[PDB]
Amino acid sequence: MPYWNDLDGDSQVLNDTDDLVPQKINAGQDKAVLILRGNAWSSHDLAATLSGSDPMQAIGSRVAAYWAREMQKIVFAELAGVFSNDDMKDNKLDISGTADGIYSAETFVDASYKLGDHESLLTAIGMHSATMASAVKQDLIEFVKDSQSGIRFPTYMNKRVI
Amino acid sequence: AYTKISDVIVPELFNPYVINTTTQLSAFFQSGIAATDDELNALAKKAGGGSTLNMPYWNDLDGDSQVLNDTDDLVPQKINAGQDKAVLILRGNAWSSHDLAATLSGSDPMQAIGSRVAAYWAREMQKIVFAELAGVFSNDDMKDNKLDISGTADGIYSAETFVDASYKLGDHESLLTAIGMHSATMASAVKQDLIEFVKDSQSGIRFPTYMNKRVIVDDSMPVETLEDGTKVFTSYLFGAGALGYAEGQPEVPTETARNALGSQDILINRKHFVLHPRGVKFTENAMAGTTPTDEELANGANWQRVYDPKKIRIVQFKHRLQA
Amino acid sequence: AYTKISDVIVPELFNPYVINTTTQLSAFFQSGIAATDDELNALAKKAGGGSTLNMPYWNDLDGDSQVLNDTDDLVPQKINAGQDKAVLILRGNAWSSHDLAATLSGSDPMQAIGSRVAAYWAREMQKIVFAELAGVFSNDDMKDNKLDISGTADGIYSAETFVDASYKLGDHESLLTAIGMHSATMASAVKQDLIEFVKDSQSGIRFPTYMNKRVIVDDSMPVETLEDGTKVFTSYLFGAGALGYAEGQPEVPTETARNALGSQDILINRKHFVLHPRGVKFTENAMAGTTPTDEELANGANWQRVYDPKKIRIVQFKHRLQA
């Protein structure tokens, strides 16, 4: 992968009676892997002419939307791979299990600030329906109807929600 | 590889660009100075190199009136004189890269590596001055009028103690502007108070505000620890207008050179600058050197101030973080 | 002092000349192929490198023949499984001079310095080879069926035992091309058999020949000794046709620098290549690095392979010299 950055290990005092030395740069050690998939499906035949229509057309015009749910099907699995079983990522997961805390108004703040200096590097919030129900009972989720015309892209705190 | 403005090293067309972008991008700013007194110029540029000068001042006449009464006479009175100092510091570092990587990512030379190094020093000052206050202004009886703490496990940092600290300058108010803030605090702030997102730049969003102030999110802060997991934070508050600095010039601001027997090529920067609060005077005691000063021993001990009380202007309060 | 296509370093007109002259001069050749796959070019020339990409094997034969008929299917041409890897190596050196003028550097700097380089830098190639090839058979079981001995107290190395080795290539006989050797053997040869200096080109000179083959001679081959003061020789036999190699290039194949306080100037070459048997995959086990490896480590251990028996193609036999 083509990674880049600059900063390292600073700084140093300029004086005679010394030499500076350099400091090494993190290289492109980021690594990924190609994946490939596919499948196929047949028809019947005499069933086609005997049924009063053609299965081949309907199936063939439904092929496109099939691959979406595949793509999602990979991605969810994979992220669920990164964060599991690794103490090396642990700073990015926050477990409220053990039966207290509801997701309102606080633990949300914990999430959005768990990146200490950098805030507002986040935009959209993934959500399950029943949750945002429990939100709209209590929470302030506010409806900005802006795109003309659409209803509606909800928002919590300078974010988007999906 | 390419035109290689730095790798074929055009020293012009480059160094001014880097310095200026370094100035604007980093903030702070402002808050602190832009274009301090030429005093720091005469300290920075050649000729008459450092280390630092000493500049004097005349405090104002003062005293009671006298009973004006005949069959007696008056007696005259006098003026005094006083001292002030600054310091001068030098910095530099290298870069170990292989031109393969540097212009690998870099490619088009102009914006890339320049923008980077700019962003670099931008953080460097933010480290150095913020370290400069650290020990000094906190350790003395001499500033204590500017330090109050709610610490020792009753205090909340909200909505009151903030005010009182902000009035620790009794007569002089509304000269204060920026609030230095470590993250976890302002987390506790958004958790409670009204801290109000204000959009100035049209259209851009936005610098946060508390009360007619500009809060500043800053990564590197002091922090300490006691036993029992209890924590203590600092979070300076000044927005004084200002500190001061002037850039000055070295010789050879940009140098490009390579090594035959191994395979490398490296960069260097090595800039001068002069920065110090005015503010307390600087002295020389029980330190190594010289010059420049240091980092550690450029903080740990031994500063001495004379004005005193007002127009410093900085105040600190160590507070515990909200439950 | 001179035209100095190297000292004022014109990168054109030189490096290609070097590489070509290198290919013509040193041999082998053949034996080993020239111009291997360019996937190796992807190995040296970016991208795709890293640890060494795999080379396919190619021939038309499947089970010839099959019965032309009716009422019977033919069944297709199938590719048996396989996989392999390799190494990729990076070498170079420097050279010294002095300012007291050992010069000249005649009317042809090009061919002079270029060829005088080509000699050396071509010559190390075969040393790297035999060094490496000493590793497969060193002590390993999985090649055992490709080693043979008539040795231990009776063998003459003439006219028969060689025919045994000629069986040892499993499927393919009369694919032999070249014969590894050490001198004392071919001395005994000159005493016995018809080994015949044969002018190849008319008139161009010339390869010593056993039977329509090009014999190769070098002083470094394994020579060990039992008790009873008698000697054992190795003398590999391959003539596979072939091994393979391809180049790629670093950046700056030619560089010129000087020293200041001392009085000197220096040259360097540093080119890379990929060469090995195919043959065995190359794995990292108990082997330092990385990468490339070594001479020693290129000996010690850790070569494991998949074919098995055929298209190797190399055979060794240890035997007593004529007595």
Residue numbers in the entry:
A (entry chain A): 56 to 217
B (entry chain F), C (entry chain G): 2 to 324
Task: Reproduce the article's own wording on this structure.
Here we report near-atomic models built into cryo-EM structures of procapsid I, intermediate procapsid II which has partially released the SP, and the mature DNA-filled capsid from bacteriophage SPP1. The structures are T = 7 laevo icosahedra composed of 415 copies of the MCP gp13 (35.4 kDa), several hundred copies of SP gp11 (23.5 kDa) inside procapsids, 180 copies of gp12 in DNA-filled capsids, and a gp6-gp7 complex which forms the specialised portal vertex. The asymmetric units (ASUs) comprise seven SPP1 gp13 subunits: six in a hexon (subunits A to F) and one from the capsid penton (subunit G). Gp13 has the characteristic L-shape of capsid proteins of other tailed bacteriophages, with well-defined A and P domains, an extended N-terminus arm, and the E-loop.
